[PDB]
Every structure is written in structure tokens, then in C-alpha cells.
Amino acid sequence: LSSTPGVISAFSTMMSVHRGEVPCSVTTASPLDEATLTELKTVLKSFLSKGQILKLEVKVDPSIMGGMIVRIGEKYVDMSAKTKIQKLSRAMR
Amino acid sequence: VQKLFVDKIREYRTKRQTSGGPVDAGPEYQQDLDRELFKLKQMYGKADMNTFPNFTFEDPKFEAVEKPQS
């Protein structure tokens, strides 16, 4: 009976996937204007191809210099400060 | 990422513009490689920059002995 919030919280995500989409994570900076948000919400709709209205979360993390990381479920494209760590080709060659 | 790329190419050319050599090294890199090469040249050999070597050698004196036979 102690683990009853564990069973309930598991059941919502198990029932979510019957219509849900495993939401995204865009963690770059301060929130931007509306035209940049609606454009990413209308290209990610073209990626699901499952007839399900995607949900999304935005987080603020200033440690990334000027780029953004985007995850779609378990996909995780990357355009961030790791293009500065790819400058080891000037050293390791 | 090309706009990030040319930003790197800019800072390589300002590193090309040098007039005093090592700006960030200071005496640390100057006292190191001067003492490192002299520790390696002591293991290498005492040879000058333009003195060509020339010498001669002495062969053994082919002596003889005596032996009375017939």
C-alpha cells in the first residue's frame, strides 16, 4: 500500500502512449518569439507520422554557447557547443 | 556551423601576427626547452655548428724477430 503512487504514476504514461508522443526537450536559452516556436511545432508534426498531437517542454540552460539540442523520443540530434570540442582535429589530427 | 568555422579561422590569423613570439609562454616555456635541449645535447654530443672534423690514425709498427734455422 506504500507503493500506490508508484502504480498510479506508471499507469498514466502507459495510458499516455495510447495517444502520446514521448515529448521533446529544447534546452538552449531564454524563450524566443512566437514564429520560431510555431515553425518547430509544425516540422516535428511531420516527423511523427502517427496522427498524434505532440506535446513538448522547453528548458533554459545557458551552459550551451549558441546552439540547441533536440530530442524526439529517443533520437537526440545535436547542434551545440560540442562543435567546439570537435576542434581536437587541430591537435589530434 | 560554417559561421562558427570562419570564427576559428579569424583567431588563427591573429595568432599568426606575432612580434615578440611566445606571448602566453613567458619564462616558463623559455626556461624549459632551453634546459631540455641542453640536457639532450649532453646526451647527444659536443659538436660545433660548422667545424668539419679531420684527423689521422697511427697503424701498428710491424716489427720482426730472429730465429736461427739452417
Which residues fall within 8 angstroms of residue B28, CB to CB, at 6 or more apart?
A: none
Helix (H) or strand (E) holding A42: helix A34-43
Cα–Cα separations (whole angstroms), residue A27 to A22, A36, A65, A79, B50 = 16, 14, 11, 11, 65
Neighbours of A53 (CB within 10 A): 9
> Are the CB atoms for A48 and A19 separated by under 8 Å?
no
What's the half-sphere exposure (Cβ side, CA atoms, 13 Å) at A85?
A: 7
Q: How far apart are CA B29 and CA B42, in angstroms?
A: 20
- Domain containing A53 equals 21-92
Bridge partners for A77 per DSSP: A70
- With CB atoms and an 8 Å threshold, state whether A83 touches B8: no
Q: CA-CA-CA-CA torsion for A57, A62, A63, A64, nearest 10 degrees?
A: 70
* Resolution of this entry, Å: 3.5
Q: Where are the domains of chain B?
A: 1-70
Q: How far apart are CA A72 and CA B10, in angstroms?
A: 36
A40 burial type by CB count under 10 A (0-12 exposed, 13-18 middle, 19+ buried): middle
Q: How far apart are CA A21 and CA A45, in angstroms?
A: 10
Q: Method of determination?
A: cryo-EM
Q: Is A2 helix (H, G, I), strand (E, B) or coil?
A: coil
Choose, out of B2, B4, B11, B12, the residue to mutate when testing the contact with A (most A CBs < 10 Å).
B4
Task: Take residue B48 and report the three cell numbers written for it.
Answer: 660545433
Q: Is A89 helix (H, G, I), strand (E, B) or coil?
A: helix
Q: What backbone phi and psi angles, to 5 degrees, belong to B27?
A: -80, -10
- With CB atoms and an 8 Å threshold, state whether B4 touches A87: no
Helix (H) or strand (E) holding A59: strand A56-59
Kindly state whether B1 is in contact with chain A, defined as any CB-CB distance less than 8 angstroms.
Answer: yes
Which residues fall within 8 angstroms of residue B1, CB to CB, at 6 or more apart?
A: A79, A83
Q: How far apart are CA B57 and CA B62, in angstroms?
A: 15
Bridge partners for A56 per DSSP: A24
Residues of B in contact with A79 (CB under 8 A): 1
Kindly state whether B4 is in contact with chain A, defined as any CB-CB distance less than 8 angstroms.
Answer: yes
Task: Take residue B17 and report the three cell numbers written for it.
Answer: 601576427
